[PDB]
Design a protein around this nucleic acid. Structure first.
Lengths: 199, 117, 160, 108, 51, 121, 422, 49
RNA sequence: GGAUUUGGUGGAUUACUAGC
């Protein structure tokens, strides 16, 4: 294993944000990849843990086990605002386009958020999705008309029609990465697997 | 996660799942199906076993091997566990964990388990 | 002996450990100390506890908040039968750990202020060996114990 | 349930102790002598070990990996005791003091 | 109780015999009598036979 | 504690316990008043030690009276708990005794201490 | 099951059928006055003659016994056999026997009861049929010479198996085995009904209660180490006290008070249970002696509290009840006595309770604080609320004086509270 | 200042109490008879204290 | 926390088509 629990480059690739455990408390730090920062956000609760980390174009969205989402400004070294869903289930994945923000809970519940308005727009659950370890929203135009979900297999869902569109045969193990390389071509990877499927 | 045929006949099956469980399932009659126990035998040396006081179920079985040439005389089974450096034994007749634990001795995870006839 | 280092180390108080003989170590707890150093002046706090080790294994506890030439000990712990080699209090001063390097697993945790030794832990199977060093995290309730075999074993107190 | 949730209470139970073992600090880099002294950093998540191996081994205790930050061997300087130090006024100042059965002491 | 009583008897006696200013009250005997009665009560309370 | 007499000063109380703890290590030490009383009956006791803080003190005040009769040195120490821990036991002790053993490895010290005790007497 | 096992069940069912001479010798031989040989020599009427006189002496001591002369100790009861009756008739007979044992519970020391009960044993065979009822009445007499005789002539039920050793034994049942019988969960359920019947009937007496509370307490001590079984002792044993507190007899109320205190120290419990506990404690609190015992208890129940709100104010209804049953002058007298127990957090909850609800009572708070040293947090929180009062309430000579008292003692902490609040 | 200072202050303020063991109320059976129950409760408190 | 012994019950010890 590695000390770094989770890490993520910024879209420009010039800064890397990483989380590590100090004693029993997780600390979040950012470093300049291109070239030291001694400042880390310290999670005051041992129970609290980061499940998801996402850069924003200049805050990083951190989903916790607690069931709430954290918008963190690196310079102020403080969390600007706290997105909290009604439930307490841990957030499993997070994705963004501009103001749009979509997250998933251990209850398999979808939620839509607006960064500008600071509001929960909608929440719903689609049948035939027992587990959901990955959320990815397809880059179509400037609006989110479809979303890709995978737990062990992969499923495509429509937001307005709120039902699945197409299902792919995924890996035996849980899906770990679900990036969309191009249009009609997205890569999939799973925990403890040597193989990546292009679908 | 894994399945195996216990005997030359179709009487008893060996099954493992992600719930950290190994079961004996009988096609012939459901009532015959039973779950093997994970109560550990007392070691021969006489020292205390090293493990958590809270009883926890053994990790998932990636691989399993069966033989019946020597059923009833000692352990006839090997299983491999995820992210784990030794192999545990089972006795189909006793339906209980064996008294032998088998290590790779090279700081590597177990990936393959096999039996001589 | 009590010396005031801010007044040229002049003796300010003298008293004897009741039943004291073959004393080995002394420690204070409940405030700032080497194990629980402060980060600023305002954080400075006084220790409310004091333990006195001995070769016999007796550990006499004294309530510092409550002065006499002869103070009575609140409790006289005697679970360990060997010389006390490590005496240390939790950063909050709620727990006292007494250890001896003479015999194996000679480690005991004492609840304060009850002065009652915990029973569930340590156990026969708890690996401690020749205990020779003990450390408490300033925060997080982590415990490190070193042995003559060079192994430092770590534990976490779920209360903290 | 007639038992109070101990999570809310900051006073630990008198007789029952809730403790869990974690990975050993010295597993990453074993020590060839006993552990004479141990010390936790006032702020940082670091552990120091010293002994008659004459080596000052420092470990980053995370509880899961506990990798070794750095090591310092002091030839002819047995380590009977070692400790961290931070100036109470200057938080930036950090120093390490180690000593043994010698008429000298080392500061780092 | 014979062993225990004899031990307390010596304690009471050495007070009776040698005390320079003994009060004729028997207080040391009374408190000693209390201890042995407590010793008897717990001792007789024990039952060898399994219940 | 006027009855306890002579009572060793602070200085002497170190050495008396120092011989006691070693004599315990060599199984040369008898602890308890009656056992000390028993030793005096045989005249095998080099000298007797007593705790002045015992209450009621009279229970040990019979030991001196034998020692004068048998010409045995005796002394009082202030603290009983110190005596008991010095003896090497988990209980307070009021009285202790040392055998006459000229072959003991701690021999010279025992003669040394009583030379002060007789001097203190 | 083997034929013998089913056959054995038949034997137990027809134990009192009085089948032949050999059985009838055993049934009649059982006695509480006379030995076996003489007992077999006697007839029913001679037994009835003595019992009838025995009841009359009891009637003089206590009138309620005279009722049983009409139903159990009647002349025509001699011809009444239980084996011939139907179930509807038996329960009515049983119920009458149940009541008689309750009244006889407190007069076992008196000789006439032992003679009067002989008729019940000989005529209706209470010892074999109403075996449990008889023992539950005579448990506190375990060391008495009567009790050992009970064991000899009777077959222990399953729950009383601990006493099997001492049946027909020279030594009486020892103190320890009483605890062992009580440790069993089922027996407490059985006795729970028995004490429940006495409370309804006002038949309880001091020897029972003091024997119960003192056995019930010992169950806690034996079972202190293991938390889970203590948790099982809460749904039953606390229910006992609530019933005892409901009894108008002061004897029962204090008996409950001894029970509550030991549980809390043994097992920390919710403030909600504690707040409910005092409220029931205070609901039926009339006697002076219980009033003294209750106030000690109420402090202890808070002494065990070690959670947020440990010193928070009592609720409004809770505050009103306490002052009505304990005037302020009463607690001042409570605070005056030097041997007072620790009540720092109870008083702290009280001072805040006064602070929130009563404007007149502030000047007593000053006296209350002087009498008892409050711990520095209890001081801090009291300082904290009093700061709000100044902002909200009009400034008063007492109110500033309460500040001035805090000015005199620990000046720095007063500024700290002011610094944090204003 | 900080809240955790207040918390640690609360911790240090708390003081010891005499815990109840198995053999604390066993002698109660000994003096069990012809005793006023108020005295019984007072003596139970004594043992508790 | 470890070890020894033991009581009881549950499922099989015959190939799974409903009860009375």
């Amino acid at each position: 294993d590695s000390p770094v629990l989770q890490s993520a480059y910024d879209p420009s690739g010039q800064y890397l944000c990483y989380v590590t455990v100090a004693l029993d408390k997780q600390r979040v730090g950012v470093q300049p990849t291109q070239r030291w920062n001694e400042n880390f956000l310290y999670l005051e609760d041992s129970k609290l843990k980061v499940t998801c980390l996402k850069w924003v174009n200049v805050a990083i969205i951190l989903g916790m086990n607690n069931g709430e989402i954290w918008l963190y400004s690196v310079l102020a070294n403080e969390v600007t605002y706290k997105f909290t869903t009604g439930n307490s289930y841990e957030i499993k994945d997070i994705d963004l386009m501009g103001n749009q923000l979509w997250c998933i809970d251990s209850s398999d519940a979808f939620y839509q958020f607006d960064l500008l308005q600071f509001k929960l727009l909608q929440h719903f659950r689609i049948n035939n999705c027992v587990q959901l370890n990955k959320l990815t929203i397809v880059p179509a135009g400037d609006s989110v008309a479809q979303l890709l979900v995978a737990s062990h297999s992969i499923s495509l869902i429509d937001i307005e029609e709120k039902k699945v569109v197409m299902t792919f045969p995924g890996h035996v193990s849980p899906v770990s990465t679900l990036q969309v390389i191009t249009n009609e071509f997205f890569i999939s990877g799973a925990e403890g697997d040597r193989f990546l499927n292009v679908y | 996660s894994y399945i195996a045929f216990a005997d030359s006949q179709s009487h008893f099956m060996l099954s493992a799942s992600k719930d950290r469980s190994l079961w004996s399932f009988s096609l012939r009659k459901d009532a015959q199906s039973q779950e093997m126990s994970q109560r550990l035998h007392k070691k021969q040396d006489g020292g205390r076993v090293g493990g958590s006081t809270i009883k926890s179920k053994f990790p998932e079985i990636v691989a399993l091997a069966i033989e019946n040439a020597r059923i009833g005389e000692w352990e006839n089974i090997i299983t491999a566990h995820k992210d784990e450096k030794f192999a545990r034994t089972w006795d189909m007749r006793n339906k209980r964990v064996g008294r032998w634990t088998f290590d790779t001795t090279d700081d590597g995870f177990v990936k393959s388990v096999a039996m001589s006839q | 002996w009590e010396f005031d280092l801010n007044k040229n180390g002049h003796v300010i108080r003298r008293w004897k450990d009741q039943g004291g003989v073959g004393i080995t170590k002394i420690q204070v707890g409940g405030g700032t100390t080497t194990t629980c150093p402060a980060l600023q002046i305002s954080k400075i706090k006084q220790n409310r506890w004091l333990a006195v080790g001995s070769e016999s294994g007796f550990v006499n506890l004294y309530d510092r908040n409550n002065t006499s030439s002869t103070p009575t000990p609140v409790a006289a712990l005697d679970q360990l039968t060997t010389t006390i080699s490590n005496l240390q209090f939790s950063p909050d001063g709620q727990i006292l750990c007494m250890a001896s390097r003479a015999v194996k697993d000679a480690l005991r945790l004492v609840h304060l202020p009850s002065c009652s030794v915990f029973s569930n832990w340590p156990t026969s199977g708890t690996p401690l060996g020749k205990v020779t060093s003990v450390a408490f995290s300033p925060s997080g309730g982590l415990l490190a114990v070193g042995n003559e075999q060079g192994k430092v074993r770590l534990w976490k107190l779920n209360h903290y | 349930n007639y038992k109070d949730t101990l999570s809310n209470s900051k006073l630990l139970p008198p007789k029952k102790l809730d403790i869990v073992r974690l990975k050993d600090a010295n597993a990453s880099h074993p020590s060839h002598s006993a552990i004479q002294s141990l010390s936790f950093h006032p702020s940082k998540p670091l552990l120091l070990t010293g002994g008659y191996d004459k080596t000052l081994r420092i470990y980053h205790i995370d509880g899961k990996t506990n990798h070794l930050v750095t090591s310092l061997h002091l030839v002819g300087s047995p380590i009977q005791t070692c400790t961290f130090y931070t100036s109470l006024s200057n938080q930036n100042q950090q120093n390490i003091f180690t000593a043994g059965r010698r008429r000298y002491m080392h500061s780092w | 109780i014979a062993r225990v009583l004899a031990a307390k008897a010596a304690v009471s006696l050495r007070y009776d015999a040698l005390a320079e200013d003994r009060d004729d009250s028997g207080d040391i005997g009374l408190e000693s009598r209390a201890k042995v009665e407590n010793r008897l009560s717990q001792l007789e309370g024990r039952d060898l036979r399994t219940t | 504690n006027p009855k306890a007499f002579p009572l060793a000063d602070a200085a002497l109380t170190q050495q008396i316990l120092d011989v006691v703890q070693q004599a315990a290590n060599l199984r040369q030490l008898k602890k308890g008043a009656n056992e000390a009383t028993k030793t005096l009956n045989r005249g095998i006791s080099e000298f007797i030690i007593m705790a002045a803080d015992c209450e009621p003190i009279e229970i040990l005040l019979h030991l001196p009276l034998l020692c004068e009769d048998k010409n045995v040195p005796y002394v009082f120490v202030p603290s009983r708990v110190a005596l008991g821990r010095a003896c090497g036991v988990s209980r307070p002790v009021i009285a202790a005794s040392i055998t006459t053993n000229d072959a003991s490895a701690i021999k010279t010290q025992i003669y040394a201490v009583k030379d002060k005790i007789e001097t203190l007497l | 099951s083997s034929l013998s096992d089913q056959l054995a069940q038949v034997a137990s069912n027809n134990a009192t059928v009085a089948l032949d001479r050999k059985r009838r010798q055993k049934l009649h031989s059982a006695s509480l006055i006379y030995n076996s040989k003489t007992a077999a020599t006697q007839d029913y009427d001679f037994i009835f003659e003595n019992a009838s006189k025995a009841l009359e002496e009891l009637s003089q001591i206590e009138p309620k016994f005279a009722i049983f002369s009409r139903t159990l100790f009647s002349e025509s009861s001699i011809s009444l056999d239980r084996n011939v009756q139907t179930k509807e008739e038996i329960k009515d007979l049983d119920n009458a026997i149940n009541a008689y044992l309750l009244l006889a519970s407190s007069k076992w020391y008196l000789a006439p009861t032992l003679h009067a009960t002989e008729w019940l044993v000989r005529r209706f065979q209470i010892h074999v049929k109403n075996t449990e009822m008889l023992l539950l009445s005579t448990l506190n007499y375990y060391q008495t010479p009567v009790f050992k005789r009970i064991l000899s002539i009777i077959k222990l039920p399953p729950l009383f198996n601990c006493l099997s050793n001492f049946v027909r034994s020279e030594k009486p049942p020892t103190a320890l085995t009483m605890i062992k019988l009580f440790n069993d969960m089922d027996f407490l359920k059985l006795y729970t009904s028995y004490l429940d019947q006495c409370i309804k009937h006002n038949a309880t007496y001091t020897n029972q209660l003091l024997f119960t509370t003192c056995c019930f307490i010992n169950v806690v001590a034996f079972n202190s180490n293991n938390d889970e079984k203590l948790n099982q002792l809460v749904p039953i044993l606390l229910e006992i006290s609530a019933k005892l507190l409901a009894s108008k007899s002061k004897d029962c109320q204090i008996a409950a008070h001894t029970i509550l205190v030991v549980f809390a120290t043994a097992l920390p419990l919710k403030k909600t249970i504690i707040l409910a506990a005092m409220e029931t404690i205070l609901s039926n609190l009339d006697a002076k002696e219980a009033k003294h015992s209750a106030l000690l208890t109420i402090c202890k129940l808070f002494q065990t509290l070690k959670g947020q709100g440990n010193v928070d104010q009592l609720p409004s209804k809770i505050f009103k009840l306490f002052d009505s049953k304990f005037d302020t002058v009463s607690i001042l007298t409570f605070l005056d006595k030097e041997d007072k127990p620790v009540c720092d957090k109870f008083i702290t909850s009280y001072t805040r309770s006064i602070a929130r609800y009563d404007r007149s009572k502030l000047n007593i708070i000053l006296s209350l604080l002087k009498k008892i040293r409050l711990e520095r947090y209890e001081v801090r929180l009291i300082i904290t609320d009093l700061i709000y009062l100044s902002e909200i309430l009009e400034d008063k000579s007492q109110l500033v004086e309460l500040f001035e008292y805090f000015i005199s003692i620990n000046e720095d902490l007063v500024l700290k509270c002011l610094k944090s609040l204003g | 200042e900080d809240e955790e200072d207040i918390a640690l202050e609360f911790i240090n303020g708390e003081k010891k109490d005499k815990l109840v063991n198995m053999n604390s109320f066993t002698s109660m059976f000994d003096n069990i008879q012809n005793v006023q129950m108020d005295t019984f409760f007072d003596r139970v408190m004594k043992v508790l204290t």
